[model samples]
Target: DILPANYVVKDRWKVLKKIGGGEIYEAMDLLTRENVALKVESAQQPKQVLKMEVAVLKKLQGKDHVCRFIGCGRNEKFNYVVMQLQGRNLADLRRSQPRGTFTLSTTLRLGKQILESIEAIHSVGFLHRDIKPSNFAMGRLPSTYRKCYMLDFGLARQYTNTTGDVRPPRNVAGFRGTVRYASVNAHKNREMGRHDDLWSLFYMLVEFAVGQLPWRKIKDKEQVGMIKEKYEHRMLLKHMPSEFHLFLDHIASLDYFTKPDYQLIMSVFENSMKERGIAENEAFDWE
Candidate 1:
């Protein structure tokens, strides 16, 4: 038996059935009267990941496109996080849908929602190191709003501070995400920064529209150097109807230092919304 507002510490949250659990915990719940996701961090797990995720969630709870963190706590055995569960993600949807099949309008809507989520994430001074398709879900339920929700901030990090934190000597190498969507510098032992996230998002939107990742043609990790060589030579696509791709290019360009800052990213999104003729606050509006 379960009671409202009572969280069983160091225990699973699912009451009716076991949905899933592996590297991280997940389940379907009855209490709270909604399908809630519960994640428990083992004692040996990296603390920074959990800390960063909690901090990021704190900044995003009021946002519409982000899953709300209902509760978070810790016990002798593990740290616990509870959040609202959402529907199918864009990645799985893409796998099932035909290649090159999604309409431009549909792609535009998804692209805008993704950027909105990213913008909110960035505002909090953290980086969602993992922003792939599987990490994003649509808010689908009999009672909830049908919008996209960005999920899974487990690998996130908050490296720099607003006053400008000093850089750590440590670096992340060999790629942290799916190779098909990562940027060139990310492969070179440089920890992913804001631009890397934008680049990945760009890759995802393009893949979502064209039904294939441009870099999927590469066969091995060792080939990243060769890929980088071509990438630095202006091989990446420049013109695309997707504002997401445009932002990615702008952020990762060799001359990005001379380009406009973060506000421009929002402008690109606004332009995209205009292209679709969607009014602000409308179901399809990017805002």
Candidate 2:
């Protein structure tokens, strides 16, 4: 067993169950006597280190749109990070809906919240290279259920230095995130910036609106990259509202040093909801 039920870690954290795992691992924590997600990573794998996530979480401590970090510990085999537990991820929530899609109002509501979270991440000098639906989770607590929190900062990196200087773009970079929602730049293995994250967000919004992306059927990474290069914009507009074209175009125009007009991007979705005469309701589609 990777971790037997009720196994105590570091003589404090008791693993309730395996909640999540991939390149990094996660568990429901009971040692703190509170509901928290305990993320564990193998110390031996360089790629699985929690340094960046821990640093970013510390930087994002007071932000309402990010998951809160509690504490961390390490044993011989793994590193553990304690954090606030969140509700279902957006992808799981979307799939639960009968239509596998959200109404315009619900889309706008979720989109705005996600963009605000990205804004918070950027404000603290980090770029969430992976901005897919799975990386965003809604609050689970009654007091904060309506809020969305950005998660899984394992791929995050500082786009700006401590002196407020934007880091120069790398001549080459490796593919950094989920292929389906990755930005064109990411697929190109080029340096990513705030706009790259926004591009991925645009892709997510299109999927949320139409239930699936055109490239969803293609499994080969090379083919997917080619499709993303040739027709991501075309495919997006074909199945999505025309307002999304404006959102994509806006981010496409931004450069590494440019600070994205986060509110303006958010307003595009808000205006679409308004134009359609869709009223905002607290209840989401999954509810």
Candidate 3:
């Protein structure tokens, strides 16, 4: 009941070579010939992860910025979510480049595309709890539709989980999100909505522009509260320009309604581009 073999590998979709591996699924090369990503799931793992992903994918079926799911199921070996494959994860691209690089224009093109993706999920009344550089990707779609597409939804879920409980739907309460790029409210147990996803992306865009987490060296350090507080307290003003520091201050604010609009974010990015002395249309390699 799956697609043809030339399209898959022993019920495993092998569009491109293996790019990287994760706790649950593997990232592979996405061949747009079929508009699918070939993920190999561990059969020994809990089903809820895949179940939640599929449900979210189904919820996002028609979203253009989202990768379209061709198919997913279990074989004799393991379970998988065959989705639209992509060129490269944003994290991989960042690692491949040197530090303190990447111009503002390219960053804007990439960041805006991601915002459009988040907006799609929000429109369907869903919230992508796990938005990060690793989740963002850059590549051309097929010749028919060439642009960046957002991939992966394994940890994403509807924003129905609440705070202040010993146990909740995913047994996650009190605090949530990856240490880096997670918003202050999410860590403080504030009510998270669709806008929270945008806030995280905003932080991520800044990180991408500068090629660091702004505070932590590794992506998994546990002092996000301090990092949040640093931004909250305007500690970066002494080191960076006023426009750059202020832009981050706005996005890091817990008041979602008060956050700067997307257009303003772009303007800040342009100012950052100027700070870096990058010409408007030049294509510099990622730093």
TM-score, one value per model: 0.78, 0.92, 0.69
Per-residue alpha-carbon lDDT of model 1 for 18-64, expressed as tens digits? 33441344454545555677665665565436655777888887887
Candidate 3, position 159, lDDT = 49
lDDT of 2 by residue, 84-193 (tens): 88888899988988899987667888888888888999999999888899888888888878888898988888998889899898899887578898877788888888
Best candidate per TM-score, number? 2
What RMSD, rounded to one decimal, does every model reach? 5.0, 2.1, 6.1
Global lDDT of each candidate: 0.64, 0.80, 0.60
Report the lDDT of model 2 for residue 23: 32
Regions more than 4 Å wrong, model 3: 1-18, 22-36, 75-77, 140-146, 160-176, 189-191, 218-222, 232-287
> Distance from true position, residue 271, model 3, in Å?
9.6
